[PDB]
């Protein structure tokens with residue numbers, strides 16, 4: 001029968017949201033298990049690699065958000081059309097994920113965290129937006145002629161960045177249009193309405 | 201016939217070596233274009249995202265080392281024999297790449313670089329080695345019953361780490377054994393013998 005899916009993460013969009021977008025789009029039912037940060041140290045010790053999100057599939061546990069996303073979209077319409085275009089999908093996702101992963105989300109010294117966040121957003125982020133804007137050009141989606149999970153991840157990552165830097169895309173209307181098109185996808189739009197409201 | 205392949209990176213193993221292992225193992229001819237730092241700015245301006253490695257396939261340019269590695273292994277025995285195993289391969293590779301990416305390879309001040317290296321290798325590398333040893337157990341390879349490019353990436357990342365921390369695997373003979381098994385693969389051994397000797 002249908003596989004039993006259980007996703008575990010904090011009560012945030014964060015690194016789990018790409019998986020949630022994919023489930024919503026593929027109309028796959030799953031348990032959206034959200035754990036509190038105070039109970040994190042105890043469940044961390046029980047995970048093979050001690051990091052989240054994880055996805056349990058019928059008694060087997062998977063990890064790494066992008067590895068999971070690729071697994072769920074393989075042979076679906078969210079994956080690249082050609083094998084070459086699947087490379088471009090992976091490459092755009094990793095380009096976005098490289099940048100998001102540079103932010104010191106877990107830094108314990110608040111002043112150090114603020115300094116790096118501001119540096120990344122004031123200098124690195126505008127250059128990346130310009131590279132993405134040129135890459136997209138006048139095309140409808142980032143890769144190919146139909147939406148892929150790279151388009152999802154662009155909307156998810158740009159939403160995070162816009163929390164810390166609201167003027168990020170003032171000069172990139174085509175990147176904004178792409179965000180709005182992802183958000184307008186019926187399954188995605190429905191998830192955005194009923195998902196728990198969190199800062200990040 | 202065969203597609204014409206051209207790889208561009210610096211003269212070091214670095215993030216390109218995983219691609220080089222895959223070409224050697226698959227017995228695929230390619231141009232191993234190594235550039236000096238001086239030739240980098242002019243090439244950088246031509247790349248959509250300004251980063252290497254890149255791989256040109258019949259004159260079409262791909263980027264992101266792990267996106268390229270996955271592309272080159274699809275439909276081969278290095279990719280993983282099932283869909284969930286391919287997910288585990290991606291997961292292990294990303295876990296390793298996450299940790300390598302934490303190191304400030306491009307820090308300009310040598311003192312702050314050495315501090316952060318020492319911190320990562322002392323208080324973080326042990327945890328990962330024990331996680332990987334436990335995940336491996338008594339099995340022959342990290343995923344499945346045959347070698348995958350995740351075993352290649354383990355050997356490549358552990359070679360770099362061992363340069364800075366020689367005692368890293370003193371308590372993990374099974375992880376040492378996995379390195380030796382990768383290094384004994386005839387096509388991999390041949391490449392290790394022939395490649396240019398660089399620190400990184």
Ligand SMILES: CC(C)(O)[C@H]1CC[C@H](NC(=O)N2CCc3c(cnn3-c3cccc(F)c3)C2)CC1
Pocket residue numbers: 010012013014015037040097100101102105106157160200
């Ligand atoms: C309990 C403890 C140690 O205090 C933690 C520290 C890290 C925090 N963690 C975050 O606050 N977040 C996760 C990363 C993230 C956020 C938003 N986006 N995002 C992200 C998305 C894709 C890729 C990527 F690298 C990062 C927010 C959560 C509390």
Ligand SMILES: CC(C)(O)[C@H]1CC[C@H](NC(=O)N2CCc3c(cnn3-c3cccc(F)c3)C2)CC1
Pocket residue numbers: 210212213214215237297299300301302305306307357360400
């Ligand atoms: C132009 C400038 C500023 O002078 C740069 C500074 C950083 C150098 N860059 C390195 O020295 N390296 C790249 C990363 C790396 C090395 C060894 N392994 N490795 C690696 C492998 C897999 C994943 C990963 F994240 C990192 C060494 C290249 C010249």
Ligand SMILES: N[C@@H](CCC(=O)N[C@@H](CS)C(=O)NCC(=O)O)C(=O)O
Pocket residue numbers: 014015044050051052053063064065066106294298
């Ligand atoms: N690249 C991994 C990153 C995993 C990761 O670092 N998750 C964070 C939460 S966003 C975490 O586990 N924090 C707690 C910890 O490191 O112990 C992925 O995308 O899944």
Ligand SMILES: N[C@@H](CCC(=O)N[C@@H](CS)C(=O)NCC(=O)O)C(=O)O
Pocket residue numbers: 094098214215244250251252253263264265266
């Ligand atoms: N995650 C990317 C990393 C790309 C990257 O940052 N490469 C470095 C060299 S290891 C680079 O491009 N250095 C020169 C520069 O960025 O200007 C990949 O695996 O390809």
Ligand SMILES: [Mg+2]
Pocket residue numbers: 071072074283
């Ligand atoms: Mg599936």
Ligand SMILES: [Mg+2]
Pocket residue numbers: 094097098294297298
């Ligand atoms: Mg990555």
Ligand code: NA
Pocket residue numbers: 277278279280281344345346347348
């Ligand atoms: Na295999």
Ligand code: NA
Pocket residue numbers: 367368369370371
């Ligand atoms: Na040791």
